[PDB]
Amino acid sequence: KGAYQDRDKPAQIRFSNISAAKAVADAIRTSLGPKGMDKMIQDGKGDVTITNDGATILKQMQVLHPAARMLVELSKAQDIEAGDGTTSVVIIAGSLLDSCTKLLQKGIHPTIISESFQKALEKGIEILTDMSRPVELSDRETLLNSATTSLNSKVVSQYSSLLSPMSVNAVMKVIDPATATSVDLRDIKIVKKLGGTIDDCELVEGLVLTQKVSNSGITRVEKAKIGLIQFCLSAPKTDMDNQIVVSDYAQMDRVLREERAYILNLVKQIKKTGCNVLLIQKSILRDALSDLALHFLNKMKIMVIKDIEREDIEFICKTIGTKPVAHIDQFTADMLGSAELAEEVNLNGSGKLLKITGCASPGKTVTIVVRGSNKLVIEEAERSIHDALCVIRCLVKKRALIAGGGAPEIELALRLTEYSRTLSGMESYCVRAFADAMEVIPSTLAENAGLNPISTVTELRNRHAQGEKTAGINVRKGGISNILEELVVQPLLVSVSALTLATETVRSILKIDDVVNT
Amino acid sequence: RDNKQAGVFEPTIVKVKSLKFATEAAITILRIDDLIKLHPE
Amino acid sequence: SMMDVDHQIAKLMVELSKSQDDEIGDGTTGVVVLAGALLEEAEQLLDRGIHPIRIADGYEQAARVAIEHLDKISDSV
Amino acid sequence: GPLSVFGDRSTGETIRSQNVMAAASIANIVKSSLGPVGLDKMLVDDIGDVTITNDGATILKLLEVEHPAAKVLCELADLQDKEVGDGTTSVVIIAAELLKNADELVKQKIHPTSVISGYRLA
Ligand SMILES: Nc1ncnc2c1ncn2[C@@H]1O[C@H](COP(=O)(O)OP(=O)(O)O)[C@@H](O)[C@H]1O
Numbered sequence: 001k002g003a004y005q006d007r008d009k010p011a012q013i014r015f016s017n018i019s020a021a022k023a024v025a026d027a028i029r030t031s032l033g034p035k036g037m038d039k040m041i042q043d044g045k046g047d048v049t050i051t052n053d054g055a056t057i058l059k060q061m062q063v064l065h066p067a068a069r070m071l072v073e074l075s076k077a078q079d080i081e082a083g084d085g086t087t088s089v090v091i092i093a094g095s096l097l098d099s100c101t102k103l104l105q106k107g108i109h110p111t112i113i114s115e116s117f118q119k120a121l122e123k124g125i126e127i128l129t130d131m132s133r134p135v136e137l138s139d140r141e142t143l144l145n146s147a148t149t150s151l152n153s154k155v156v157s158q159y160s161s162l163l164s165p166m167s168v169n170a171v172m173k174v175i176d177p178a179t180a181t182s183v184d185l186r187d188i189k190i191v192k193k194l195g196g197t198i199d200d201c202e203l204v205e206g207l208v209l210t211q212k213v214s215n216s217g218i219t220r221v222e223k224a225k226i227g228l229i230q231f232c233l234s235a236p237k238t239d240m241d242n243q244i245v246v247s248d249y250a251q252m253d254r255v256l257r258e259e260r261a262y263i264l265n266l267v268k269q270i271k272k273t274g275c276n277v278l279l280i281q282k283s284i285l286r287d288a289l290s291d292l293a294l295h296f297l298n299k300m301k302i303m304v305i306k307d308i309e310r311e312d313i314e315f316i317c318k319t320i321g322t323k324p325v326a327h328i329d330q331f332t333a334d335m336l337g338s339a340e341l342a343e344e345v346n347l348n349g350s351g352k353l354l355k356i357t358g359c360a361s362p363g364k365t366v367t368i369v370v371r372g373s374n375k376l377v378i379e380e381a382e383r384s385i386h387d388a389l390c391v392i393r394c395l396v397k398k399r400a401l402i403a404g405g406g407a408p409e410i411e412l413a414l415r416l417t418e419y420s421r422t423l424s425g426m427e428s429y430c431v432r433a434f435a436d437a438m439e440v441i442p443s444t445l446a447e448n449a450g451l452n453p454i455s456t457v458t459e460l461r462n463r464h465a466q467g468e469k470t471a472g473i474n475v476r477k478g479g480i481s482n483i484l485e486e487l488v489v490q491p492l493l494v495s496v497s498a499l500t501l502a503t504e505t506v507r508s509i510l511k512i513d514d515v516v517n518t
Numbered sequence: 519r520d521n522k523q524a525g526v527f528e529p530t531i532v533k534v535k536s537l538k539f540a541t542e543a544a545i546t547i548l549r550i551d552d553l554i555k556l557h558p559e
Numbered sequence: 560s561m562m563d564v565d566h567q568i569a570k571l572m573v574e575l576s577k578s579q580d581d582e583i584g585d586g587t588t589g590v591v592v593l594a595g596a597l598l599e600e601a602e603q604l605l606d607r608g609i610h611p612i613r614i615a616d617g618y619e620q621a622a623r624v625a626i627e628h629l630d631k632i633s634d635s636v
Numbered sequence: 637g638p639l640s641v642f643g644d645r646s647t648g649e650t651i652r653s654q655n656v657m658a659a660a661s662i663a664n665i666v667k668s669s670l671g672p673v674g675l676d677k678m679l680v681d682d683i684g685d686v687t688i689t690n691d692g693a694t695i696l697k698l699l700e701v702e703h704p705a706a707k708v709l710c711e712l713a714d715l716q717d718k719e720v721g722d723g724t725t726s727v728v729i730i731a732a733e734l735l736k737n738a739d740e741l742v743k744q745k746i747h748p749t750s751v752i753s754g755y756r757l758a
Pocket residue numbers: 031032033034036053054084085086087088089149150152153403404405406441445472473474475486488490
């Protein structure tokens with residue numbers, strides 16, 4: 001007889017947290033895998049969202065239980081570190097906690113569970129790395145297969161043939177493949193435009209803008225010289241309080257005339273450089289493009305796009321080699337960008353786009369125009385393309401590849417069962433729980449595919465024990481097979497990060513024993 | 519009736535776009551297997 | 560019996576304990592604990608995807624085995 | 637219960653049947669306005685403002701639709717009107733019928749991914 005444990009609220013809190021986490025996991029289990037389906041979410045305001053993304057689903061369903069909130073943060077962290085696996089990570093976390101339930105019931109301490117889970121995590125990282133194979137960024141087929149695998153789960157999977165090569169080109173265009181250790185997906189601009197179908201999505205090497213052209217009649221420009229203007233083409237205005245006091249009738253005519261002359265001198269200094277396309281930054285506190293200035297620019301045959309945003313400036317410069325000019329004195333020819341074409345293209349009466357294509361200095365930037373028949377399908381196409389880009393980013397970070405179809409989860413389950421049998425004690429039960437908990441992703445893949453989960457997972461375990469460690473659930477044949485023949489591959493980083501973040505979140509939730517209402 | 523000789527003509531784009539858009543809509547709606555409708559605030 | 564239950568499965572568990580008391584007069588807490596444990600294990604089996612009727616049939620099989628094993632290890636007074 | 641979300645949750649055949657019902661509602665609104673023998677509709681805007689029309693896009697724009705799976709078909713008619721200018725009724729009718737038959741298959745437990753692949757191929 002040890003310590004009576006006079007208090008039961010810590011255990012009640014542990015069980016409540018575990019129940020909430022398992023509820024979240026069991027709620028999103030259906031959105032896992034190629035045979036997984038989407039969820040519609042109508043916000044309180046009425047904003048509808050169809051999605052297959054775990055992070056999106058959890059962020060959009062206003063979860064209230066603390067443990068469920070923590071799983072939301074977990075999925076967001078997975079979205080940050082890998083951008084793919086935001087459903088697998090939540091399912092793994094929920095399963096680890098659901099196993100902690102019976103462990104606690106057996107009478108093991110949460111600290112022992114936490115430490116044994118850390119042990120299982122380290123052994124599992126070892127196991128996954130052993131399973132992994134290195135990858136060369138030159139392996140375009142491997143990159144295409146990673147992207148296709150990432151897209152198989154989403155509504156845009158019949159369009160994988162189109163959106164995987166784009167998702168590989170974009171990333172391979174915005175990084176130096178020899179030196180790159182990561183990727184900034186802000187180099188990849190995505191432009192959602194209603195209309196057409198998802199088969200109309202496009203990869204624009206140049207620049208795309210939603211801002212409208214101000215000139216009428218000048219919509220297309222070949223051999224385009226482009227200038228960024230951070231100053232205002234309007235009557236002069238000092239930053240101090242300025243007035244123009246008239247005391248004679250002549251000064252009125254003089255005021256109008258001198259304003260005309262100021263504006264004309266500005267537009268002439270612009271024309272003299274050879275500029276035929278003019279991007280004007282957005283200007284509050286002063287008119288950036290007066291009607292006089294527009295008149296003169298149009299007469300001088302210059303396309304004008306104003307209302308450019310102060311956050312798109314670095315992107316536009318990175319793209320078309322322009323240099324932003326804030327004083328007319330510094331507006332010269334070396335501060336321009338040469339583009340083989342600049343056109344305002346129409347999209348079947350569904351809007352207009354300014355496309356600056358062709359560039360003498362196309363610097364590590366690309367744009368993806370996402371088309372679609374509905375706002376919902378466009379939004380989910382954007383999310384899926386982001387997942388594919390993030391998979392390529394994981395591949396760039398860690399040059400290692402792992403098979404899919406639940407092969408890593410089954411191999412993990414098996415080898416950690418062996419590890420548990422070797423680490424006899426009370427850690428043995430916890431490590432065996434960790435193993436059988438991770439054996440839940442294959443079960444989910446099977447259930448969603450429409451197979452018998454028990455038989456499928458037993459066959460998978462048996463073949464992995466025989467030695468087929470690259471064996472998984474072939475939803476095309478309907479059973480088990482070598483999953484590399486179906487070309488289901490994913491970056492090792494995804495599985496590794498999922499495991500790490502799930503184990504840390506589980507340990508955090510296990511270190512909790514009370515809830516207060518501040 | 520022979521509608522080509524009767525003069526009942528439609529631009530090909532009508533039927534083509536109808537089919538494509540209807541298919542896109544059907545796929546989007548069929549992809550839904552769950553619905554979470556949040557209580558307004 | 561004194562418990563003011565509203566849930567119908569909890570009412571079934573009250574009936575279970577009452578039945579043990581009627582037939583035997585002892586075990587009224589063991590029956591409830593054991594039934595709760597069986598359902599708690601069926602929970603994981605359903606998570607793995609087994610049909611609840613298959614679970615019930617496996618439970619019947621194991622229950623027959625356990626009953627015969629009790630007759631086997633029993634003693635007499 | 638276990639899920640603590642502050643809202644309602646439909647799942648499975650329930651929500652699939654609901655989506656098909658909504659789409660069917662939208663299509664049955666406009667079916668009567670199809671072809672040389674179709675007839676027009678009055679629409680009263682809660683103030684006595686009257687609108688006569690046979691244009692399915694116009695009808696579905698004027699209606700106040702509450703279901704998102706029906707808003708999808710309304711936007712479909714709008715998109716057909718933007719990109720073509722004709723077919724706004726036929727496209728809605730066809731989308732709803734595809735939804736109906738595809739949900740019948742999903743009830744027969746053909747996987748929706750398989751229905752979607754077959755629809756794309758067709
Ligand atoms: N064609 C396929 N066959 C078998 N498994 C697949 C296939 N495509 C993806 N998967 C598996 O589906 C899981 C990821 O699916 P997904 O729904 O995107 O979840 P997550 O958000 O966790 O990536 C991974 O285990 C991956 O290996």
